[PDB]
């Protein structure tokens, strides 16, 4: 049986549930794929440029998580699909010996939303996850505000047409999104009274972290604001990545069904 190797690059990487869900798919779909994939967690040094490792490990494809998604966009040979406008890559595939970058966070976030009744959004964060979410939400015709602590990174969000803040804007937002970078989200991302204000006027508190209740979500829950963690995004984005790992042979809906079941 033909073997191919995949993994997910991050630091930290111990928490990632990508190997669980991708391995479940590779084991089921080996029938149709006519190879058996195995998918590994891969801890990289902070300074890594990724490509050397990808090639040394003989990977066919990989995912990229914190804090490497912007670096992946820089180091891949070719960027395809909506990643062209995300400034960030979360999926790498070796295609004809070119390292090709995609971004499945954008659509995976969109698919994860139950309602499309949302008109505007405040994204907390400025890393690869925030960039893909801003791209996607602007594409869907929401107004997007982005709140962070420095002037670095602002050109991307301003070129998208986002309203960029470093002090929390006195406005109501339908979606309030914790996409803070290089963070595990164990800590409130804003002053608690400020977040309470947003939650009381907001329609959904959405936190990209998955696999525990963050204090951000717990505050929304206490306030009876509807809230959503990162599980359904992870699973849709992973299923989309799996579609790419299959050379578009297995549709994401079929990967999704397997992944959700095992998760
Ligand atoms: O936790 C994980 O395994 C992942 C989380 C998201 O950042 C993804 O975009 C990434 O591809 C994988």
What's the domain range around 193? Answer: 105-237
Distance separating alpha carbons of residues 229 and 139, to the nearest angstrom: 22
Cross-strand pairs, 36: 3
Distance separating alpha carbons of residues 17 and 125, to the nearest angstrom: 22
The CA distances from residue 145 to 23, 155, 175, 184, in Å, are 37, 14, 10, 22
User: Do 121 and 49 sit in the same domain of this protein?
Assistant: no
Residue 103 Cβ < 6 Å to ligand 1: no
Give the distance (Å) from ligand 1 centre to CA of residue 8. 8
User: Do 115 and 80 sit in the same domain of this protein?
Assistant: no
User: Do 34 and 122 sit in the same domain of this protein?
Assistant: no
Distance separating alpha carbons of residues 136 and 99, to the nearest angstrom: 24
Cross-strand pairs, 143: 120
Pick the catalytic residue from 31, 51, 69, 138.
69
Report the candidate in 53, 183, 92, 50 with the shortest Cα–Cα distance to residue 129: 183
Both tokens assigned to 232: 């359904």
The ligand 1 atom at the shortest distance from the C-alpha of residue 65 is: 7
Q: What is the CATH number of the domain that holds 190?
A: 3.40.50.720
Distance separating alpha carbons of residues 89 and 105, to the nearest angstrom: 9
The CA distances from residue 41 to 29, 38, 62, in Å, are 20, 10, 10
Residue 181 Cβ < 6 Å to ligand 1: no
**Would you give the DSSP letter of residue 82?**
G
Both tokens assigned to 95: 């295609």
State phi, psi for 165 to the nearest 5 degrees: -130, 150
State phi, psi for 203 to the nearest 5 degrees: -105, -30
Structure-solving method: X-ray
Q: Which residues contact 99 (CB under 8 A, 6 or more apart)?
A: 51, 54, 55, 75, 76, 77, 78, 92
For tokens 């604001």, the residue is 225
């Amino acid at each position: 049986m033909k073997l191919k190797s995949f993994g997910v690059f991050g630091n930290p990487i111990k928490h990632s549930k990508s190997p669980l869900i991708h391995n479940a798919c590779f084991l089921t779909f080996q029938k149709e794929l006519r190879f058996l994939g195995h998918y590994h967690p891969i801890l990289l040094p902070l300074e890594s440029h990724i490509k050397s490792e990808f090639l040394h490990l003989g990977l066919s494809g990989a995912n990229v998580t914190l804090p490497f998604k912007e670096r992946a966009f820089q180091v891949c040979d070719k960027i395809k699909g909506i990643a062209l406008e995300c400034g960030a890559v979360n999926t790498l595939v070796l295609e004809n010996d070119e390292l090709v970058g995609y971004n499945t966070d954008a659509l995976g976030f969109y698919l994860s939303l139950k309602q499309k009744n949302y008109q505007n959004a405040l994204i907390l964060g400025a890393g690869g996850s925030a960039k893909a979410l801003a791209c996607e939400l602007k594409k869907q015709g929401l107004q997007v505000s982005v709140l962070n602590r420095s002037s670095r990174g602002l050109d991307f969000f301003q070129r998208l047409g986002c309203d960029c803040f470093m002090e929390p804007p006195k406005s109501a937002f339908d979606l309030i999104i914790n996409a803070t970078s290089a963070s595990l989200h164990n800590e409130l991302p804003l002053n608690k009274e400020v977040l309470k204000g947003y939650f009381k006027e907001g329609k959904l508190a959405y936190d990209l972290a998955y696999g525990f209740l963050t204090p951000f979500l717990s505050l929304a829950k206490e306030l009876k604001t509807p809230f959503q963690d990162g599980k359904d995004m992870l699973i849709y984005a992973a299923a989309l990545s799996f579609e790419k790992f299959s050379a578009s042979q297995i549709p994401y809906s079929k990967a999704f069904e397997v992944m959700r079941s095992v998760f």
